[PDB]
Design a protein around this ligand. Structure first.
Ligand code: AWV
Ligand code: AWV
Ligand code: AWV
Ligand code: AWV
Ligand code: ZN
Ligand code: ZN
Ligand code: ZN
Ligand code: ZN
Lengths: 360, 360
């Protein structure tokens, strides 16, 4: 059976289990069950399922070289699917809450969940909470007796926490760190001293890389009982690297991809994001370019957003991106090489993750 | 050492551990550490600590009748304190998110967290997320090797989920169930057919009783390794009953306690809450009283909120409250009696929980 139809079949199974359990144990009525079904479909479906399918792909690699009964192969593939949906629901939680936090309008060519007429922020914040709670309901039901439950829950917990810390890094990236104070309304940075590669790297590592690359790879190893087939430090280092590349590509597309293909109107410039474009521009700008950037960045005024996009264009950031990309290819190829020492199979799953990221 | 100074000492220990771990493992800077310290103090401290201290009290009861080394007594008391702070942080999460959801202005005589000038909703939603993530960081660090970790995490998970489901029950309690539809803006009920005791009971059981009474009692039993000293069905039934009484008292105070003593201006009437007052009023109103209620309920207009408060006053709901209270006393005394069959110690902790609720 093809990996994707297995994954989607498990979505239907996990949805039915969750909604049936709300009816049998949580006293839910049919109308609220329907609302939660529709919230689940709207918030969890419609992407590429890259994160969840990575768990499945890693598990498939190990199945091709490991002796098991047929029934055990089916159990491992089911477990990989459930663990993949745990990550897809964790993401769904963060996308719902982030869209509310950032006052976002669209995602994947549809209104943000909170903007649905019958939802509103009051409901959406709690729907987000429910989405993350469903990750734990899935785990405890499907993995109750599994030898990897402890390790999976502890990892999942740490990655969820890392993500929430990265969110804090991201929402505060345009503030001066010395001025952060719950008692005082936060002015935007005037110097942009904190728009550095190391500070950018810290945001992306916590907000994106742990849940998008580390967790899917390590969960594929845990459901496979294969974590001692790998050097965990190499897994962390290659996750780091690939996830950062993913986020740099995202940041470039925010500014330069047509809205019709992006699924939204990019607002990183108006939101004064610590973006790869802003850090890379400041890393090569002359004094006049820096001064014009400070005059225009972080403002809704379309004229000022256009002055920032023209500054980025004139600054030939395509060159910097090509150089960054070439350095990432060297380093990720080097880490895939080191991974082949303890597991060729796992090294090959990382190579697939990298291919799917590099030209998406 | 007095229970309360032990509990507060552990807050300082757990705060230091969390902030030190953010610095050693999550690359946090001093200014963001200070912001999170202040968010933790502002959102977790200043209440009565009833929920957390219940874990400590249940553990203290078992210590008085169970042979242990001194060091083991100290470990159980520490564990009860950490488990109590897990519930206090879980509550803090829900109070932050609920204040944002409901557009609340004050809590405990201070602005809601999201309303602090240097916070805003963008940050506060994520601060709420962090608060619940800290529950899991506490558990995994302090309880890593504990025999009760599995059972504690599974219970905690289910109670958190129940609470989020109850939130959904509460925010949708003024909608007609058949009209719930994410695609369609929700009108307020015109008939109030769903303002019934059974529907009220469902809201309160899920939103309040699991985290405020069931979880503290059962966590005190888990850290004590004493869960087979009790009939879990009796624990669920007495938690049910006491928690509902707590929420009925809350609802009455929303309408009738001066704001200076409430710590806020009650808005349940304007928010069209399915409150004990609204259900109890509709349970005894004549046709003209019901019609005037429908004309005025669920509107910001102070004149209309005053018409609802005068309707409640004229309706002598004090009588209904006295009758309800008398029925709760019978039933809770009956359940404390049944609990004494398997554990007198535990029965006595439930009696203390009830006394502290009954005349607060
Ligand atoms: C699709 C889905 C997720 C992402 C992210 C990652 N960020 C999402 C926002 C919430 C938490 C921060 C991480 C960048 N681009 C995306 C395209
Ligand atoms: C500035 C920097 C880089 C680029 C690119 C190259 N793109 C490759 C497609 C994947 C996403 C990365 C961007 C096109 N326009 C740019 C302007
Ligand atoms: C102090 C603290 C908590 C409560 C509640 C319980 N509700 C809180 C709001 C969030 C989740 C629903 C439960 C009622 N009155 C309170 C006084
Ligand atoms: C309507 C219903 C009951 C009452 C009470 C009795 N109060 C006892 C104090 C604890 C909280 C419950 C309320 C005073 N005014 C009321 C109006
Ligand atoms: Zn965001
Ligand atoms: Zn982006
Ligand atoms: Zn509320
Ligand atoms: Zn209330």
């Amino acid at each position: 059976m093809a990996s994707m139809e297995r994954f989607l079949s498990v979505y239907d199974e996990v949805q039915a289990f969750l909604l049936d359990q709300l009816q049998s144990k949580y006293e839910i009525d049919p109308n609220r069950a329907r609302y939660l079904r529709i919230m689940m479909d709207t918030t969890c479906l419609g992407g590429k399922y890259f994160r969840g399918m990575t768990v499945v792909n890693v598990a498939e690699g190990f199945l091709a070289v490991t002796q098991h009964d047929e029934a055990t192969k089916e159990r491992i593939l089911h477990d990989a699917c459930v663990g993949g949906w745990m990550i897809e629901f964790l993401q769904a939680h963060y996308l719902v809450e982030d869209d509310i936090m950032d006052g976002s309008v669209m995602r994947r060519g549809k209104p943000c969940w909170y903007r649905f007429p019958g939802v509103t922020t009051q409901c959406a914040i709690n729907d987000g909470i429910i989405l993350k709670s469903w990750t734990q309901i899935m785990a405890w039901h499907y993995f109750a007796d599994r030898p990897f439950l402890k390790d999976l829950l502890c990892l999942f917990q740490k990655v969820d926490y890392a993500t929430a810390v990265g969110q804090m890094y991201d929402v505060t990236s345009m503030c001066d760190s010395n001025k952060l104070d719950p008692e005082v309304a936060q002015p935007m940075t005037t110097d942009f001293a904190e728009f550095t590669p190391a500070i950018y790297k810290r945001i992306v590592k916590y907000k994106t890389t742990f849940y998008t690359y580390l967790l899917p790879l390590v969960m594929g190893l845990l459901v496979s009982e294969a974590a001692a087939s790998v050097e965990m430090n190499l897994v962390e280092r290659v996750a780091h690297l690939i996830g950062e590349y993913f986020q740099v590509q995202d940041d470039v597309m925010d500014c330069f991809t047509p809205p019709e293909q992006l699924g939204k109107v990019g607002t990183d410039i108006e939101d004064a994001k610590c973006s790869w474009l802003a850090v890379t521009f400041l890393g090569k700008a002359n004094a006049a370019q820096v001064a014009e950037f400070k005059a225009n960045y972080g403002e809704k005024d379309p004229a000022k957003v256009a002055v920032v996009k023209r500054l980025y264009s004139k600054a030939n950031l395509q060159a910097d991106f090509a150089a960054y990309e070439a350095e990432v290819v060297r380093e990720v190829e080097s880490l895939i090489e080191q991974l082949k020492v303890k597991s060729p199979t796992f090294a090959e799953s990382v190579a697939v993750v990298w291919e799917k990221t590099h030209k998406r």
